[PDB]
Amino acid sequence: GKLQDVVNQNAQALNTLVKQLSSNFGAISSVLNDILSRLDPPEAEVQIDRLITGRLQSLQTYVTQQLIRAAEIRASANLAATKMSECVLGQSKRVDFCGKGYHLMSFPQSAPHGVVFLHVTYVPAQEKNFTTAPAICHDGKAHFPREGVFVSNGTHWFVTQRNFYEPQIITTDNTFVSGNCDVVIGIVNNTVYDPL
Amino acid sequence: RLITGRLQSLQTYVTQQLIRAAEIRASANLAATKMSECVLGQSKRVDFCGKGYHLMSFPQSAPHGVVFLHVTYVPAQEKNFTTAPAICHDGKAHFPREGVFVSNGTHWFVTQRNFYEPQIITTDNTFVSGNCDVVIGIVNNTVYDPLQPELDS
Amino acid sequence: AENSVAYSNNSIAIPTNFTISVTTEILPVSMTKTSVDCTMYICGDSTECSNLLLQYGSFCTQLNRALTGIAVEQDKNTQEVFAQVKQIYKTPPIKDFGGFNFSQILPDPSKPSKRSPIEDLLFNKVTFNGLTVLPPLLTDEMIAQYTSALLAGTITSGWTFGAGPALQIPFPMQMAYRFNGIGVTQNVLYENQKLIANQFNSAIGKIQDSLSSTPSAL
Amino acid sequence: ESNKKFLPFQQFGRDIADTTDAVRDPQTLEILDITPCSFGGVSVITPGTNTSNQVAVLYQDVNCTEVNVFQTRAGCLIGAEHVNNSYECDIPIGAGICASYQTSQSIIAYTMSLGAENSVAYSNNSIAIPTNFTISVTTEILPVSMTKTSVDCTMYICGDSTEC
Ligand SMILES: *[C@@H]1O[C@H](CO)[C@@H](O[C@@H]2O[C@H](CO)[C@@H](O)[C@H](O)[C@H]2NC(C)=O)[C@H](O)[C@H]1NC(C)=O
Ligand SMILES: *[C@@H]1O[C@H](CO)[C@@H](O[C@@H]2O[C@H](CO)[C@@H](O)[C@H](O)[C@H]2NC(C)=O)[C@H](O)[C@H]1NC(C)=O
Ligand SMILES: *[C@@H]1O[C@H](CO)[C@@H](O[C@@H]2O[C@H](CO)[C@@H](O)[C@H](O)[C@H]2NC(C)=O)[C@H](O)[C@H]1NC(C)=O
Ligand SMILES: *[C@@H]1O[C@H](CO)[C@@H](O[C@@H]2O[C@H](CO)[C@@H](O)[C@H](O)[C@H]2NC(C)=O)[C@H](O)[C@H]1NC(C)=O
Ligand SMILES: *[C@@H]1O[C@H](CO)[C@@H](O[C@@H]2O[C@H](CO)[C@@H](O)[C@H](O)[C@H]2NC(C)=O)[C@H](O)[C@H]1NC(C)=O
Ligand SMILES: *[C@@H]1O[C@H](CO)[C@@H](O[C@@H]2O[C@H](CO)[C@@H](O)[C@H](O)[C@H]2NC(C)=O)[C@H](O)[C@H]1NC(C)=O
Ligand SMILES: *[C@@H]1O[C@H](CO)[C@@H](O[C@@H]2O[C@H](CO)[C@@H](O)[C@H](O)[C@H]2NC(C)=O)[C@H](O)[C@H]1NC(C)=O
Ligand SMILES: *[C@@H]1O[C@H](CO)[C@@H](O)[C@H](O)[C@H]1NC(C)=O
Ligand SMILES: *[C@@H]1O[C@H](CO)[C@@H](O)[C@H](O)[C@H]1NC(C)=O
Ligand SMILES: *[C@@H]1O[C@H](CO)[C@@H](O)[C@H](O)[C@H]1NC(C)=O
Ligand SMILES: *[C@@H]1O[C@H](CO)[C@@H](O)[C@H](O)[C@H]1NC(C)=O
Ligand SMILES: *[C@@H]1O[C@H](CO)[C@@H](O)[C@H](O)[C@H]1NC(C)=O
Ligand SMILES: *[C@@H]1O[C@H](CO)[C@@H](O)[C@H](O)[C@H]1NC(C)=O
Ligand SMILES: *[C@@H]1O[C@H](CO)[C@@H](O)[C@H](O)[C@H]1NC(C)=O
Numbered sequence: 001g002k003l004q005d006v007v008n009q010n011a012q013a014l015n016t017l018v019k020q021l022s023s024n025f026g027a028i029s030s031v032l033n034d035i036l037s038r039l040d041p042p043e044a045e046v047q048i049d050r051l052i053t054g055r056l057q058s059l060q061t062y063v064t065q066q067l068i069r070a071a072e073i074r075a076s077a078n079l080a081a082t083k084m085s086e087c088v089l090g091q092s093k094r095v096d097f098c099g100k101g102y103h104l105m106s107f108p109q110s111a112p113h114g115v116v117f118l119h120v121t122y123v124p125a126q127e128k129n130f131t132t133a134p135a136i137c138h139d140g141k142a143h144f145p146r147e148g149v150f151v152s153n154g155t156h157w158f159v160t161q162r163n164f165y166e167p168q169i170i171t172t173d174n175t176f177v178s179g180n181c182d183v184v185i186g187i188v189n190n191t192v193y194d195p196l
Numbered sequence: 197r198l199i200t201g202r203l204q205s206l207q208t209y210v211t212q213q214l215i216r217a218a219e220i221r222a223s224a225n226l227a228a229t230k231m232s233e234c235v236l237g238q239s240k241r242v243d244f245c246g247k248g249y250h251l252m253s254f255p256q257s258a259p260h261g262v263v264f265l266h267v268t269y270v271p272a273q274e275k276n277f278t279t280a281p282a283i284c285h286d287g288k289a290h291f292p293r294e295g296v297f298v299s300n301g302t303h304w305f306v307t308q309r310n311f312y313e314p315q316i317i318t319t320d321n322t323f324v325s326g327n328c329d330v331v332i333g334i335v336n337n338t339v340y341d342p343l344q345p346e347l348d349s
Numbered sequence: 350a351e352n353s354v355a356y357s358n359n360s361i362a363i364p365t366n367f368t369i370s371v372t373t374e375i376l377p378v379s380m381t382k383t384s385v386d387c388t389m390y391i392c393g394d395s396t397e398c399s400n401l402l403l404q405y406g407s408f409c410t411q412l413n414r415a416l417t418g419i420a421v422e423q424d425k426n427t428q429e430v431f432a433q434v435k436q437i438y439k440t441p442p443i444k445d446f447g448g449f450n451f452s453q454i455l456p457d458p459s460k461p462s463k464r465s466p467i468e469d470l471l472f473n474k475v476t477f478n479g480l481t482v483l484p485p486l487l488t489d490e491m492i493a494q495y496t497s498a499l500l501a502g503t504i505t506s507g508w509t510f511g512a513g514p515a516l517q518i519p520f521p522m523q524m525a526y527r528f529n530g531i532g533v534t535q536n537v538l539y540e541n542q543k544l545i546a547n548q549f550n551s552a553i554g555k556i557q558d559s560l561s562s563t564p565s566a567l
Numbered sequence: 568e569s570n571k572k573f574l575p576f577q578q579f580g581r582d583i584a585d586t587t588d589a590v591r592d593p594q595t596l597e598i599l600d601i602t603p604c605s606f607g608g609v610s611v612i613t614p615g616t617n618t619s620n621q622v623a624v625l626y627q628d629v630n631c632t633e634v635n636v637f638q639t640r641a642g643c644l645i646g647a648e649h650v651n652n653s654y655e656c657d658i659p660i661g662a663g664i665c666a667s668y669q670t671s672q673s674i675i676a677y678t679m680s681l682g683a684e685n686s687v688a689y690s691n692n693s694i695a696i697p698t699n700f701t702i703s704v705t706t707e708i709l710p711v712s713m714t715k716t717s718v719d720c721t722m723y724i725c726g727d728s729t730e731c
Contacts (some may be wrong), residue, residue: 002708002709002710002711003708005729006710007714010713010714010716013411014716016407016410016411017718017723018665019406019407020406020407021723022406023404023405023406023600024404025404025405025406026401026404027674032725032731033728035672036728036730041730044614044730048730048731051724052724052725052731053404053407055723055724056724057207059409059718059720059724061207061408061411061722062718063718064211065411066716068214068215068218069713070713071218072218073710073711073712073713075222075225076709076711077709077710077711077712079709080709080710080711081716083709085631093240094233094237094239094241094633095232095233095236095237095508095511095512096232096233096236096433096511097229097232097233099703099705099707100511100512100703100705101512101513101703102512102513104702111711113710113711113712113713113714114657114708114709114710114711115708115709115711116706116707116708117706117707117708117709118704118705118706119704119706119707120227120702120703120704121702121703121704121705122512122700122702122703123512123513123700123701123702124509124512124513124514124516124697124700124701125514125697125699125700125701126697126698126699127514127695127696128695128698129518129693129695130644130693130696131692131694132518132519132522132692132693132694133524133692133694134521134522134535134539135539142536144534144535144536144539145535149522149612149696151694160696162526162696163696163697164696164698164700165653165696165697165698168586169675176534178313178534178536178540179536179540182538182712183539183540184540184542185447185521185539185542186503186521186691186692193605196343196346198391198392199391199392199401199402199405202390202392203387203408204416205389206387206390206409206412207408207412209385210385210412210415210416213383213415213416213419214415214419216380216523217380217419217422217423220377220378220379220380220423220426221422221426223376223378224376224377224378224379224426224429224430225429226376226498227376227377227378228429228430228433230374230376231430231431231433231499232433232511235499235503236433236499236503236508236510236511236512237508237512238508238527238530240530245437246370246372246374247370247372248370248501249531249562250531251369251524251527251530251531252503252507252524252527254454254500254503255431255496255499255500256454256465256468256471256496257431257471257492257493257495257496258375258378258468258471258472258475259377259471259472259475259489260377260379260380260381260475261375261376261377261378261428262375262376262378262431263373263374263375263467263471264374264375264376265371265372265373265454265467265553265556266371266372266373266374266375266519267369267370267371267549268369268370268371268372269367269369269370269528269531269533269551270367270369270370271364271366271367271368271370272364272366272367272368273365273366274363274364274365275362275363276360276362277360277361277362277363278359278360278361279359279360279361280359284465292539294360296363298361298363299486299496307363308532308533308534309363309532310364310416310531310532310533311363311364311365311367311533311534311537312363312364312365313534313536313537323562333358333359334536346444367641384608386608389606397634424659430680434682435682435683436682436683436684436685437681437682437683437684437685438685438686438687439684439685439686440689441686441688441689443689445691448689477603477606479606481607481608481627481628481642482628483661484640484641484661484662485661485662486659486661486663487663487679488662488663490663491663491679491681494681495681498682505687505689506687509695513697514697515685515687515695516694516695516697517687517688517689517690517693517694517695517697518694518695519689519690519691519693519694520694521691522694
């Protein structure tokens, strides 16, 4: 329907301009040839100028309405050039610019007086209950995850990424030590497995 | 005479309304972009969700408008530091992974750029790339191995 | 102000502190829906003029069509702005957000109109020859319910509700991931959780004072 | 009947837009307001003609006791009943009221449903992590160009006439 409105608004405004040629505009006849054939040329100039003012105002309305719709189309055309530069030619960090969800890639499709984008997105499906803690205390040390989150399934604590469930053993490789464990609110007690 | 004057008043009013409709819709298209990027996520773009490093923002409904409360991160207190691009070693050059080498006058330390939190320059947070005769401005300092005292035990 | 920052080939500047700042950005959304009829504006109650108006043709057929296209897009402009979310999220009654206070932006159930205190003074500072005013598609209470759904989806879920299903996360923990997006590690938030929450509460309350300080902000 | 405070020498009354609002009747010392006679557009609310031929007439911006009948803030509805439950909007009317064709079938009027009510469980030590995902492909359509049209004043206004 977005491409249907551009064809419909341009064709209906054109048919309005043709319909303005059948208007009298206060004159005797809308058709020009019957004015000359029935009125004398010394006083026909009054009847001619009634048709000129009405027909020029139809063109002045049509050109002004076309310049309004030209700015609307060019704003979408400037948007469509931005979409192909950012969604097709790369991966966009912006949210809801290349579809709903985490953007992976997109494909262009040529359309009559338009462009169709096929935004391939990443949408999470199945989540469940988890118990989390901001950090884990140790022997005088507090351990924070590098790029993960501390989660628990009820008995054991694990570290995993945020966009997918893939638990791992909390070791010193994926955690970094920053201070002790009396400042961070909500810190829990668990061991950290040394791989050395 | 009255019809031509009154129709020109309507033709001026409709044309002026269509001009202001495009100005409002441009702001409405901007406001839809702001809520999609500042409210529904964190924006990497600078000065799009307030002045400073953007953290989050909150919408507020307004009569014929929208009010955004952009929560930003602004640094406050900085002081003097001495920096070097890298640190040479026994035939090796050490570059920081996600930090910057700084000195307080006597000792060299590694810390992040947006906050001061110095750490001991070790092999965990540094990577070795070549020797130390190509990088201009490299200084001489030791790199503490966190595995060497375990070998001597 | 003239500033000459000291530049050197071995000198750097690193902030040892920070300041949480809340700024106010105002953007218009929609106009007022207005429809004008040529039958009553140009010449009302006169049957000798409407016969003369038919000689001009269809000047006013496209004139009311242009104003209808303006009014149908004023209601459309609210749709892509305030109705970005499909579901309505509710804040839980236990306001335990790790010291963070959202009472100025959360709606107040005591008032007959469920609006936030910041939204309360925003509305207070803003005030027939064929002329009519069409009411908008969405009422002021429905826009406020759209705002409360997005506010509850940001404190509880964050950005997860806009990219899929809403995933719960504490506000004291998802604020660290906002710190990671600007290059700050997670330990800075947890070592200064009382200071950041006090800075956020003071900056939110200064918005209500700054909005009522001058009428030129709106 | 009005409760205005006209001066004893004052007879006419105008607003900011110079429209007569209150004039005295010249015999009795009385004040009478003048509001214009009520007018508005006529809007027909219908489903598709392949579905049904029943229509609902919306008389905009009028108290239609002067002209089922349900009074709204956009006027009133004729032929459309009012229901207490709220559904999704498909045919907009205004002020949070939308008409539809549901339930032996008749046009109903209701308040807009803004969405499904969701109360996600929030806690200070509870998180939600997706164990799966779904690859979704969405279609976005954007117009690019208009139709190139050129109009000449020599032929459109008056063709073949050298006197014009
Ligand atoms: C939480 O996850 C851990 C890791 O899988 C579970 O521990 C194992 O559970 C299985 C039962 O299927 C046992 O056979 C293993 O011996 C367990 N491993 C260890 C090291 O004990 C744990 O049971 C899970 N807890 C809950 C409540 O589901
Ligand atoms: C985590 O473990 C530490 C020690 O293993 C706990 O610290 C003890 O806390 C009790 C009561 O607060 C004191 O009486 C002890 O003297 C503390 N021991 C030490 C070595 O400091 C700490 O409370 C535990 N945390 C949690 C949440 O259980
Ligand atoms: C630069 O920072 C280092 C690290 O803190 C300082 O070294 C320590 O300084 C304190 C003085 O408050 C001494 O008590 C410690 O013994 C020092 N540590 C070592 C390993 O020697 C250093 O003094 C700072 N330099 C300057 C100029 O401020
Ligand atoms: C860092 O230390 C190395 C060696 O520890 C220095 O290299 C020496 O430089 C001098 C003069 O340039 C030479 O005479 C030596 O033969 C070099 N030694 C070696 C082992 O190559 C280097 O100059 C030091 N860099 C700085 C900036 O002081
Ligand atoms: C960083 O800045 C904050 C304020 O922006 C400092 O917090 C203040 O500390 C002083 C110390 O006496 C207190 O009197 C104030 O009440 C604190 N303000 C608030 C709002 O709590 C903080 O101390 C600074 N930190 C550093 C390391 O300089
Ligand atoms: C959030 O902030 C508001 C004020 O902005 C707090 O409301 C105040 O509460 C105290 C006592 O709790 C009263 O003495 C004040 O009169 C209240 N002020 C206003 C303007 O209402 C509110 O308590 C804060 N939230 C929490 C959980 O503390
Ligand atoms: C994640 O979701 C996908 C589908 O979205 C699951 O794949 C289906 O698995 C069932 C298991 O019996 C099969 O019958 C279907 O044919 C699979 N669908 C497709 C399209 O192949 C997948 O099993 C889910 N994974 C988890 C761990 O829940
Ligand atoms: C999941 O379970 C935890 C406790 O096990 C509970 O606190 C939380 O509310 C549950 N979430 C949902 C969505 O049921
Ligand atoms: C978390 O909330 C519970 C009650 O819901 C409370 O008992 C507990 O102390 C809280 N923990 C923290 C770290 O705030
Ligand atoms: C900070 O001190 C260094 C030397 O210690 C100097 O080079 C630099 O210009 C100083 N910067 C400022 C802002 O004073
Ligand atoms: C840095 O600048 C100083 C003078 O300001 C100069 O002596 C020194 O050689 C320079 N070092 C480098 C690595 O360019
Ligand atoms: C008008 O004049 C008549 C006298 O013929 C008098 O009876 C009547 O009261 C007058 N009306 C008013 C409103 O004074
Ligand atoms: C319409 O008229 C009735 C009188 O029967 C009145 O009660 C009602 O308030 C009027 N409605 C409006 C919107 O003025
Ligand atoms: C709707 O509910 C009201 C009470 O709130 C009742 O008077 C009215 O009859 C109901 N209408 C229908 C159609 O059930």
